[PDB]
Amino acid sequence: GPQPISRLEQCGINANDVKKLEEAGFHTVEAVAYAPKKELINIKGISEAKADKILAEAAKLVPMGFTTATEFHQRRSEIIQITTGSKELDKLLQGGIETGSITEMFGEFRTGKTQICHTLAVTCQLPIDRGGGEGKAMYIDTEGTFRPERLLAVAERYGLSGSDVLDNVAYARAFNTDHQTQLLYQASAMMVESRYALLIVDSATALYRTDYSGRGELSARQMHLARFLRMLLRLADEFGVAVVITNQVVAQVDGAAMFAADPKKPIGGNIIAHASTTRLYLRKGRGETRICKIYDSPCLPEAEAMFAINADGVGDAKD
């Protein structure tokens, strides 16, 4: 059961300190042992040495090894946010693409997913103060639409060296789902050696459309997709990198529009709907302007922003 603070008396403290702790709402050994340092060093009638020895003597009884919300929010300033190259998108995302999570972007054709991936593959190499992540990038490609010339065009904008930028990007091509899953082991092996800040899969569901066909193969497809996403989550958690994946869309032909023009929803179903942390839905505007919307996020309200695709990558709409 609970251990009252009466044991502190035989542990080597006077009655004044335990009386003050009782008057401060502390009434058990466990609460004092797991209390944050500031909470019992900012109180009246205490000293730094007294608090340190109190923690040392309390840790003996209560078994330590449990994380607490304060000891979790204080340690997470490590989370870096990578700028997307557009001020509007950075403002919408409140900093940019977070690390240690999975971000998904889906939409129809020419919406700008590949362009955003290309821009991020360069922006992730900037110094932290400039908005980058100070690392390299991986690009796993399943469609064959990787263009280094866009990388060079983006690099010229920030005044970087083209040769170095092209040197600091790794590339692999996946020809089926088994190869796609197999590449992640080598991805981890290579992340061990060096410092990577980003991993990109484009697309994460293109090959599942045709590798498993019909209603008679849905279950195996979903199981394979779930295993792949679990591997991605393990990689992101272990190495503290940012994972960005893309997705396709499907039509709703059941006649359930009711003033909803040309409805469409992402493929992959509940498995990919649950695995991802932040989901972005890309649309098209007039000319070269696009609209980005927040589809799902644990800590962000739903809003919209407008960006554009220029000759130097993703940026802001000109006037």
């Binding site: 609970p2 797991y34 304060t70 209603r215 199981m223 909803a260 509940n270 649950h274 644990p298 800590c299």
Partner: protein, 336 residues
């Protein structure tokens, strides 16, 4: 423990020769097993079983009138845990029961994690305001913990909770009493719930358990041809959780995913809870948070509905709610 029984020395010697320890493993075996192991006749075996059973269960008698009248002696039948919103409390007629498993189910963006965080905030309020004056345990099985949302909720707590006196909230230290755990496998989850949660509950650190997803670990290993081990694991997990909740009088809340329906009460609905009937048998109260996004989305705001699926004491009903910068708020005057 065996020698505590009032019995002649002959049967005591026979039991000692038979390698018995306590009344629990005496009642574990059956008639013919005891006859084979101990070499005793039927009348004395029956007498020993009767005496051990009397010792184990005592001789007390309880009536429903005592349960109804004596509120303090039986808090499980009367004490409830508030959800922090009067509309939700009215829908649930007080809040979560202290004994048994409660389930939240729904698709993505329904608002399950926000409700879990709000409950973790409100569990440690004083007794007169619905709380239990105890911490919470949070287990994550899919992704990382919503840190910023938690910080915002702690900041907005004076704004969200207006009935509580203002001078009382500042003494409430919120983040220091919430525990976070992370698991990545079914075996890891089983070991955690076996040998970590009881330690937390024994010392009085926390009196609330939240699992952010039970379907996430299970939907990855077992395919459609391995239902027996999956059912065994689900039964073991449910039994352990119910035992802990009954022993320590602490609510248990489970977050669940949904599947596609392509006999169980779901006909005019496109989604159903994921695990199946085996897991559905272990539950007490079943809710379903749902967001109607395909329709009535052009009006400008999301439409969120919380529905009671089943409960021994709650009629099937539903209400509406919204998620804002301070937490989850139920819309007044919308109960079905």
């Amino acid at each position: 423990d065996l020698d505590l029984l009032d019995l002649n020395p002959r049967i005591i010697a026979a039991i000692k020769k038979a390698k018995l320890k306590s009344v629990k493993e005496v009642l574990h075996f059956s008639g013919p097993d005891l006859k084979r192991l101990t070499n005793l006749s039927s009348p004395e075996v029956w007498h020993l079983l009767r005496t051990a059973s009397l010792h184990l269960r005592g001789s007390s008698i309880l009536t429903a009138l005592q349960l109804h009248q004596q509120k303090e002696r039986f808090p499980t039948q009367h004490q409830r845990l508030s959800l922090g919103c009067p509309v939700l409390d009215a829908l649930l007629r007080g809040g979560l029961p202290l004994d048994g498993i409660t389930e939240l189910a729904g698709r993505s963006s329904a608002g399950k994690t926000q409700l879990a965080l709000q409950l973790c905030l409100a569990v440690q309020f004083p007794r007169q305001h619905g709380g239990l004056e105890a911490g919470a345990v949070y287990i994550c099985t899919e992704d990382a913990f919503p840190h910023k949302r938690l910080q915002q909720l702690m900041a907005q707590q004076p704004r969200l909770r207006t009935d509580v006196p203002g001078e009382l909230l500042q003494k409430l230290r919120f983040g220091s009493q919430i525990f976070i755990e992370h698991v990545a496998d079914v075996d890891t989850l089983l070991e955690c719930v076996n040998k970590k949660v009881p330690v937390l509950l024994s010392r009085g650190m926390a009196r609330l358990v939240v699992i952010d997803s039970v379907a996430a670990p299970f939907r990855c290993e077992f395919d459609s041809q391995a239902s027996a081990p999956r059912a065994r694991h689900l039964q073991s997990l449910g039994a352990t959780l119910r035992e802990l909740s009954s022993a320590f009088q602490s609510p248990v809340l489970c977050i669940n995913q949904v599947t596609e329906a392509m006999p169980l009460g779901f006909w005019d609905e496109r989604v159903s809870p994921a695990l199946g009937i085996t897991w559905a048998n272990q539950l007490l109260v079943r809710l379903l948070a749902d967001r109607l996004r395909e329709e009535e989305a052009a009006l400008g705001c999301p439409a969120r509905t919380l529905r009671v699926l089943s409960a021994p004491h709650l009629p099937p009903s539903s209400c509406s709610y919204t998620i804002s910068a301070e937490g989850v708020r139920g819309t007044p005057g919308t109960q079905s």
